[PDB]
Short mmCIF file of C-alpha atoms (C1' of nucleotides) in Angstrom, two decimals:
data_model
loop_
_atom_site.label_atom_id
_atom_site.label_comp_id
_atom_site.label_asym_id
_atom_site.label_seq_id
_atom_site.Cartn_x
_atom_site.Cartn_y
_atom_site.Cartn_z
CA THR A 1 37.18 -14.58 77.18
CA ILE A 2 35.84 -15.65 80.58
CA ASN A 3 32.48 -16.71 79.14
CA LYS A 4 34.01 -18.76 76.33
CA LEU A 5 36.50 -20.34 78.73
CA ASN A 6 33.49 -21.30 80.85
CA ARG A 7 31.76 -22.82 77.83
CA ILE A 8 34.81 -24.77 76.65
CA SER A 9 35.47 -26.08 80.17
CA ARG A 10 31.77 -26.97 80.24
CA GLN A 11 32.02 -29.05 77.07
CA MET A 12 35.28 -30.70 78.13
CA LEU A 13 33.84 -31.59 81.55
CA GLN A 14 30.76 -33.12 79.94
CA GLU A 15 32.82 -35.00 77.36
CA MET A 16 35.45 -36.53 79.67
CA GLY A 17 33.56 -36.54 82.98
CA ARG A 18 35.83 -34.51 85.27
CA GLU A 19 37.04 -30.95 85.75
CA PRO A 20 39.45 -30.22 82.86
CA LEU A 21 42.96 -29.25 83.91
CA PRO A 22 44.28 -25.87 82.68
CA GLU A 23 46.70 -27.54 80.24
CA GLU A 24 43.92 -29.25 78.30
CA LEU A 25 41.84 -26.07 78.44
CA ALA A 26 44.74 -24.10 76.96
CA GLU A 27 45.11 -26.75 74.26
CA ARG A 28 41.43 -26.42 73.34
CA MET A 29 41.60 -22.59 73.40
CA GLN A 30 44.81 -22.44 71.30
CA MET A 31 46.09 -19.95 73.90
CA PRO A 32 49.08 -20.09 76.27
CA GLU A 33 48.54 -21.75 79.63
CA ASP A 34 49.74 -18.60 81.41
CA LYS A 35 46.91 -16.62 79.81
CA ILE A 36 44.45 -19.30 80.93
CA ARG A 37 45.70 -19.02 84.50
CA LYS A 38 45.50 -15.22 84.33
CA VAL A 39 41.88 -15.42 83.16
CA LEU A 40 41.00 -18.02 85.80
CA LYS A 41 42.40 -15.90 88.65
CA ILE A 42 41.28 -12.55 87.23
CA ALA A 43 38.56 -11.32 89.64
CA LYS A 44 35.98 -13.33 91.51
CA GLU A 45 33.31 -11.04 92.88
CA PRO A 46 34.34 -9.46 96.21
CA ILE A 47 32.90 -11.13 99.28
CA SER A 48 30.77 -9.06 101.64
CA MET A 49 32.14 -7.81 104.96
CA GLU A 50 28.95 -9.04 106.63
CA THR A 51 29.16 -12.76 105.80
CA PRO A 52 28.24 -14.66 108.99
"C1'" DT B 1 -14.93 5.03 120.57
"C1'" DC B 2 -13.59 0.34 118.36
"C1'" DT B 3 -10.51 -2.87 114.83
"C1'" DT B 4 -6.19 -3.58 112.20
"C1'" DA B 5 -1.92 -3.49 110.32
"C1'" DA B 6 2.73 -1.78 111.20
"C1'" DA B 7 6.83 -0.90 114.40
"C1'" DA B 8 10.01 -2.14 117.86
"C1'" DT B 9 12.31 -5.09 121.41
"C1'" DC B 10 14.00 -9.22 123.23
"C1'" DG B 11 21.52 -10.61 128.77
"C1'" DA B 12 26.85 -10.85 129.15
"C1'" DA B 13 31.25 -12.62 128.05
"C1'" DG B 14 33.53 -16.87 125.17
"C1'" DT B 15 34.42 -18.58 120.27
"C1'" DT B 16 34.52 -17.54 115.45
"C1'" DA B 17 37.97 -16.78 110.47
"C1'" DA B 18 34.25 -17.05 103.51
"C1'" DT B 19 33.15 -20.30 98.41
"C1'" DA B 20 30.95 -23.35 94.25
"C1'" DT B 21 24.21 -21.52 88.21
"C1'" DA B 22 23.50 -18.69 84.06
"C1'" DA B 23 27.93 -13.69 71.20
"C1'" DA B 24 31.18 -12.82 67.98
"C1'" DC B 25 33.79 -10.05 64.64
"C1'" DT B 26 35.88 -5.97 63.43
"C1'" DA B 27 37.84 -1.42 63.57
"C1'" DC B 28 40.23 2.12 65.82
"C1'" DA B 29 42.73 4.66 69.32
"C1'" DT B 30 45.41 4.60 73.40
"C1'" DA B 31 48.56 3.04 76.90
"C1'" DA B 32 52.33 0.32 78.18
"C1'" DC B 33 56.92 -1.63 77.61
"C1'" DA B 34 61.50 -1.71 75.85
"C1'" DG B 35 65.68 0.38 74.00
"C1'" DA B 36 69.07 4.17 73.35
"C1'" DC B 37 70.85 8.59 74.15
"C1'" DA B 38 72.07 12.65 76.76
"C1'" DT B 39 72.75 14.72 81.21
"C1'" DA B 40 73.66 15.45 85.88
"C1'" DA B 41 75.78 13.65 89.83
"C1'" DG B 42 79.45 11.41 92.13
"C1'" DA B 43 84.29 8.91 92.56
"C1'" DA B 44 89.10 8.97 91.73
"C1'" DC B 45 93.70 11.00 91.14
"C1'" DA B 46 96.68 14.55 91.13
"C1'" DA B 47 98.16 18.82 91.75
"C1'" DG B 48 98.66 23.31 94.28
"C1'" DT B 49 98.50 26.49 98.67
"C1'" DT B 50 99.62 26.94 103.56
"C1'" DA B 51 101.00 26.65 108.13
"C1'" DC B 52 103.11 24.04 111.67
"C1'" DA B 53 106.24 20.38 113.64
"C1'" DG B 54 110.85 18.36 114.60
"C1'" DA B 55 115.10 18.31 115.15
"C1'" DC B 56 119.28 20.95 113.77
"C1'" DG B 57 122.16 24.98 113.74
"C1'" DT B 58 123.17 29.13 115.73
"C1'" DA B 59 124.02 32.59 119.29
"C1'" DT B 60 124.87 33.70 123.98
"C1'" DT B 61 126.61 33.25 128.47
"C1'" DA B 62 129.37 31.26 131.94
"C1'" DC B 63 132.97 28.28 133.38
"C1'" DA B 64 137.64 26.90 132.72
"C1'" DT B 65 142.40 27.70 131.05
"C1'" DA B 66 146.16 30.29 129.62
"C1'" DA B 67 149.27 34.25 129.98
#
DNA sequence: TCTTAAAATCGAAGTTAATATAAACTACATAACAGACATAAGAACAAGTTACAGACGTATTACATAA
């Protein structure tokens, strides 16, 4: 789901020229916008406790 | 006995607050969420059981009155 969201947001960005808003991404995925926001916020890799 | 690569060290506070690249379909089992029922726990009312209080009634004594 994350990978194919990345690819669809890829294609939309390259076709319109700007970062696609979650509403248009949900429209292209045929999935609810709440699910799109859940996927987008799911888990970015934890930052290290030694970052200067 | 003489090179030569490694190994280790190099002042205190003070402040400081992060990022950002890069398969799909299908089949099955399991966990989670919601609803309904039964059960245990508490709230409410009413009754009964019991002794004590509060003022009354009684009993006793002393003063007054009558013979």
